[PDB]
Amino acid sequence: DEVKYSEEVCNEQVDLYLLVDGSGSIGYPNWITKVIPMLNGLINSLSLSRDTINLYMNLFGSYTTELIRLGSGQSIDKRQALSKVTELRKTYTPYGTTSMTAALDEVQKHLNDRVNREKAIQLVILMTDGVPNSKYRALEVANKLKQRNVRLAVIGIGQGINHQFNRLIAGCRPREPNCKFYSYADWNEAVALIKPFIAKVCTEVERVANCGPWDPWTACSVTCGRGTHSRSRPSLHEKCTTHMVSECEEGECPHHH
Numbered sequence: 001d002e003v004k005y006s007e008e009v010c011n012e013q014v015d016l017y018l019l020v021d022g023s024g025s026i027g028y029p030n031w032i033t034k035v036i037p038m039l040n041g042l043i044n045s046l047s048l049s050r051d052t053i054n055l056y057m058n059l060f061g062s063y064t065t066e067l068i069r070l071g072s073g074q075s076i077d078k079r080q081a082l083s084k085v086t087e088l089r090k091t092y093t094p095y096g097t098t099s100m101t102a103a104l105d106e107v108q109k110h111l112n113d114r115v116n117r118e119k120a121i122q123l124v125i126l127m128t129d130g131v132p133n134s135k136y137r138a139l140e141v142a143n144k145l146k147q148r149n150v151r152l153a154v155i156g157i158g159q160g161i162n163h164q165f166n167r168l169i170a171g172c173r174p175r176e177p178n179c180k181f182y183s184y185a186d187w188n189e190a191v192a193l194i195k196p197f198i199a200k201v202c203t204e205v206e207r208v209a210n211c212g213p214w215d216p217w218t219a220c221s222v223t224c225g226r227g228t229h230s231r232s233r234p235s236l237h238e239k240c241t242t243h244m245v246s247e248c249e250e251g252e253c254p255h256h257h
C-alpha cells in the first residue's frame with residue numbers, strides 16, 4: 001500500500017548560467033562602460049545561496065573559460081561572484097572571435113552529466129552583441145536547450161549589436177511588442193527581464209509514497225486462547241509504518257485445578 005502526507009513545494013532553486021561574450025567585437029570601451037556595470041547590477045540583484053540561486057559563469061571569445069562552477073563558494077556567495085567581476089574589469093580585455101555555440105554547449109553538458117539540480121529552474125542569461133562564429137550552430141544549441149525546459153534570456157551588449165540575431169535566438173516573435181526574452185538597455189531593465197523567470201512560487205501539495213508489502217504475520221503469541229501477533233516490513237520511506245500488531249485466537253484453553 002501507500003502513505004500520504006502534506007508538504008510545501010517552492011521553486012526556490014535556480015541554476016543560473018551566465019554566459020558572457022568577451023570577443024573582440026564587444027570592444028574594450030564597451031567592456032568598461034557597459035558590460036562590467038551590467039554584470040555588477042545583475043549579480044547584485046541575485047539572491048545567491050546554497051539552497052536557492054546558484055550561479056555558473058562562462059566567458060566566451062576565441063576560446064571559452066569556465067569562471068564559476070555551480071555550487072562553489074563563488075557560485076552561492078554574492079560578494080565572491082562580484083569579486084570575479086572585479087577581476088574581469090581589471091585584467092580582461094576583449095579580443096578574438098565568438099565561441100557562442102561552445103558556451104551554450106557547456107550548459108548542455110551540465111544537463112547531460114546531471115550536474116544541475118534536478119528540481120532547479122534552469123535559466124541561461126546570454127550576454128552578447130549577437131555575432132557568433134556560426135549563426136546556425138548557435139541557434140541550434142539554444143533551441144535544443146529550450147526543448148529540455150531551459151529558459152533563455154538574452155542581454156544585448158557591445159558597441160555594434162545585431163538585434164535581429166539576438167531577438168531570433170531569444171525567440172522573439174516578429175510584429176509582437178515587448179519581447180519578454182530580450183533586453184538591450186541598462187542593468188535595471190535586465191533585472192526586470194529576469195524577474196518573472198525566477199519569481200518564487202510556494203504551494204501546498206499532497207505527496208504519496210509506496211510503503212511496500214508486509215512480511216507474513218507471525219504465529220500467535222499463545223498456543224491456546226487469546227493472544228497477539230504482528231507483521232513487519234522494511235522502511236522504504238520515512239513516513240511509512242513498518243510494524244503492526246493485531247489480536248489472534250488459538251481455540252480455547254483447558255480448564256485446570
Ligand SMILES: *[C@@H]1O[C@@H](C)[C@@H](O)[C@@H](O[C@@H]2O[C@H](CO)[C@@H](O)[C@H](O)[C@H]2O)[C@@H]1O
Pocket residue numbers: 222223224225253254
Ligand atoms: C501451547 O500449546 C497449548 C496446547 C497449551 O498447552 C499452551 O499451554 C497453556 O498456555 C496458557 C498460556 O498461554 C496457560 O494459561 C495454560 O496453563 C497452558 O496450559 C501451550 O503454551
Ligand SMILES: [Cl-]
Pocket residue numbers: 098099100101102132133134135137138
Ligand atoms: Cl558559435
Ligand SMILES: [Mg+2]
Pocket residue numbers: 023024025026096097098131
Ligand atoms: Mg564577436
Ligand code: NA
Pocket residue numbers: 058066106
Ligand atoms: Na563549463
